[PDB]
Point group: D2
Chain length 213, copies 4
């Protein structure tokens, strides 16, 4: 599969649809605003649509290395502000994946270049949860960190001006922390679901509590 | 559809893979590195893997409002630098889409909040090609702006220190600018494809010249 | 002058003041909020205070390479938002300097590393004003670009959500574009002063008009 | 004082230099590169050149709300990378100040607008040392937080790829963490000074340990 394949793939996939499944494009035209914002990793190991069965246009997507929400990344903050205040999504899903290359790179810490600064936000989680991660056998620490990262970015998202204002003014927005494995593509809920400032703190605090012994 | 629906859709998707297509999670077990970086818009009207037929794990992907490549957005630059220097993708594709609401709102300029600052980069492109855009019928402008955007993001991408270093050190990295519409999902090459500094400039200049045509 | 000098410098400069000029620190305690926001270059060839005679605490300062306001730099945008909405400054001054190393680096374009991406925002001005800059003798193009850069960042600052909202709601905020030379430290007004959206566009458009022949 | 005042102050400053101190603009004509990068807070209660007595042209300077060094702020990273790789400064100084309104508002947490997102990085430091901060009298906390901030920004700076690369390739670059108050302008070494990876970690750890003392 080279570039020349992608275009002819597309040209025959579009031609089969207009000939055979015309409602696909008509579904897109009558597609309403998305109700889901998906924040995922650039690895995109399984695409979000196939993972959840969402139709085209039903979800708004952001992706960056290791699905981060940095307090001061305007790229991601601008996706969220537009999602919550303009489109008025009802669910934000943050989704990590076990075996993510960014997360593993943050632990091994090779000299990769510019990307290492982005990843410093994960080394910080790794060191924040040092004792929690220590208590566990070596072979589970990478997937645990993948989970901790997702929980921390849920925590970060809820603490931003976008979500703070939305919840203060009563807008119904729910944040979910998810992860899936490569063996089964089975979504796993990290159980840190937040619907307001109150549940944000309790569920986060409980989420960290369950990983500890 | 609510959240429990997605969970049950996911469960029923997982099983119809492990029984019908077991060589799927195997194909993903083997960490085979993506050959393509797709920079698209968060709108994701038609998912990239559907538009192209690429298997999961064959594309590295970044998505923001209106598929921008801003010279000093560390988020997208981190994605690009990781794709080029670590994964060593051979092709980067910036894909816009006609009818893009980020491009619409840049022009209409409602008071949306934080996002209007992101959108000023698009309004910059609007004003830059004001003349070109005026020589056209009004109904054709928004879509020309969607094409101008992609073409300027390709220009910006080629100018990043990442792309400059890779091209100077001999790494084959080709950059493409595409767009599609909702009526057929047909990909449209904007013809600003670049493989080194010289083609970056000549194809960009050629791309702005061909919109003068009609 | 090494590090050890700076500390003992400070320890005797503070000691002379408390002994001899105590009103300096008492002026600081009763110092009200600043009325000026200064956005300048990291070169800081002449410090802003000596350039204008402002007392300590009278100005709020941001500095970055080549005094830029990028549409989406949250570092600078956050300084401005805090300056305009919290401190309620009355004047924002953007100040470039002839002979700035960032501006010159953007034209010569050496392979400097990470910084070159920041500077791409100036190469863009250089190419935006290609014909205007061409019409002039080679030896004036660098200082002209220094001036164009300042005007463009005034233009950018006025177009941000911070200033747009402030002017819509009637807040009196004035943006100034300044530059000084190294031969005399004489401030030069670029005459693109904006007090609302209307003057923003007229003065910017006139500022570019005066550089052309 | 309004704008015309600054213009006339500037004019009367220029002349009292060219007549009384002509070897000032000469000293600046010679492009002698700064040996110091000062990362301070936009509050600039006492200008850095006054605090230290450094001549103009001897310091490269960056200033933001609460003198932050965020891992992914390209603005400050650009300043640092230019100072270390091009100017080759030998010392970097991050200087906080007691009474800093950015630190105050991080704790008090009013609904200020866009700036609260910048300030979340400080609230992160507050929560991190919650225990340390609680073993102290309340009136001493805000100032301890001002010191904790500087110490964490030094930690962050030392971890940037810029500082990692320079230390690994042998470039003498020393990083310092300082603070001062308004009552005397006396500089206070926070003692987290670092010259390589090993001292970065040990001085940081030692710095958080010594605030447990009293
Ligand atoms: Zn990943
Ligand atoms: Zn779009
Ligand atoms: Zn400069
Ligand atoms: Zn401060």
């Amino acid at each position: 599969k080279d570039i020349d394949t992608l275009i002819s793939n597309n040209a025959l996939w579009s031609k089969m649809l207009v000939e055979e499944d015309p409602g696909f494009f008509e579904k897109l035209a009558q597609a309403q605003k998305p109700r889901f914002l998906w924040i995922g990793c650039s690895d995109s190991r399984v695409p979000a649509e196939r993972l959840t069965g969402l139709e085209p246009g039903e979800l708004f997507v952001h992706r960056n290395v290791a699905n981060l929400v940095i307090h001061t990344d305007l790229n991601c903050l601008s996706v969220v502000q537009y999602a919550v205040d303009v489109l008025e999504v009802e669910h934000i899903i943050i989704c990590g994946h076990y075996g993510c290359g960014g997360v593993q790179a943050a632990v091994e810490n090779p000299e990769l270049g510019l990307i290492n600064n982005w990843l410093l936000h994960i080394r910080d989680i790794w060191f924040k949860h040092s004792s929690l991660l220590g208590e566990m056998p070596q072979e589970r620490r990478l997937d645990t960190l993948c989970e901790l990262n997702v929980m921390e970015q849920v925590y970060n998202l809820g603490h931003s001006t976008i979500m703070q204002s939305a919840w203060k003014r009563g807008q119904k927005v729910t944040i979910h922390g998810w992860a899936y494995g490569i063996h089964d593509g089975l979504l796993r809920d990290l159980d840190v679901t937040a619907t307001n400032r109150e549940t944000l703190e309790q569920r986060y605090r409980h989420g960290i509590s369950n990983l500890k012994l």
